[PDB]
Amino acid sequence: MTEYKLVVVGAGGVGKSALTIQLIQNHFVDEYDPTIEDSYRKQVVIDGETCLLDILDTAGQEEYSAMRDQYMRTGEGFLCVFAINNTKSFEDIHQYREQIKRVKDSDDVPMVLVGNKCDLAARTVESRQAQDLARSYGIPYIETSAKTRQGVEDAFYTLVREIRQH
C-alpha cells in the first residue's frame, strides 16, 4: 500500500488538531491544548486504494514551533488551515506557504487551503476571498468544521488527490 505523508499547518487556534482528531478518531475536541508535534496513522480506502495516511499535526504558536522546519521536510502534501472567524490567520497563510516552499525547496508542492470553523456565524473571511488566494497558488479551497464533521474527510482526501496529481 502507498503511504501519504500529510502535514497540517497554520496559526495557533485555527483547529488543526481538532480537524486531524475528527478525521482519525471521530470526535470533536472542545478544549484548547496547544500542540508541539504529534503524528497520527490510519489505514483508509480512498478512491479504491487502501493507503496509510501519516498525518503530522504541527504547532501554530511561536513558543511551541521549535522543530517545525525539520518535521515538515518529509511532508508530501500540506493542509494550510485558517479559521473563517480569524482574519489574521488568513493573512498569515502566505507565510506558511513560503515556509513550505523553503522546506521542500520547490514551487510545486501539493497543498489544499482550508477555511475551518464554518459552523460559526462570526465570519470575517468570505469564501470568495479564500477562493482567490487558493486560485493564485493553483490549489483548491475547502471549508470545514471540526465540530460538525462538514468537509473534514473531503479536505484530507482532496489533499491525497493533489499528491496523486504530482
Q: Please, which residue, 29 or 46, has the CB nearer to ligand GNP?
A: 29
Would the annotation count 154 as a binding residue? no
Tell me the closest approach of the beta carbon of residue 110 to ligand GNP, in angstroms: 20
DSSP string, 51-116: EEEEEEEE--SSTT-TTHHHHHTT-SEEEEEEETT-HHHHHHHHHHHHHHHHHHT-S---EEEEEE
* Residue 117 contact, options Ca ion, ligand GNP, Mg ion, none, Cβ 5-8 Å cut-off depending on partner type: ligand GNP
Alpha carbon distance 59, 35 (integer Å): 5
C-alpha–C-alpha distance, residues 134 and 160, integer Å? 17
By CB under 6 A, name the binding residues for ligand GNP. Answer: 12-18, 29-32, 34-35, 59-61, 116-117, 119-120, 145-147
Whichever of 31 and 135 has its CB closer to ligand GNP, that residue is 31
Rounded to an integer, what distance in angstroms lies between the CA atom of residue 111 and that of residue 139? 6
Residue 28 interacts with Ca ion (CB under 5 A): yes or no: yes
Judge whether 145 is annotated as a binding position.
Answer: yes
Which cell numbers hold the place of 112? 489544499
Nearest approach in angstroms of CB 152 to ligand GNP is 9
Binding residues for GTP: 13-18, 29-35, 59-60, 116-119, 145-147
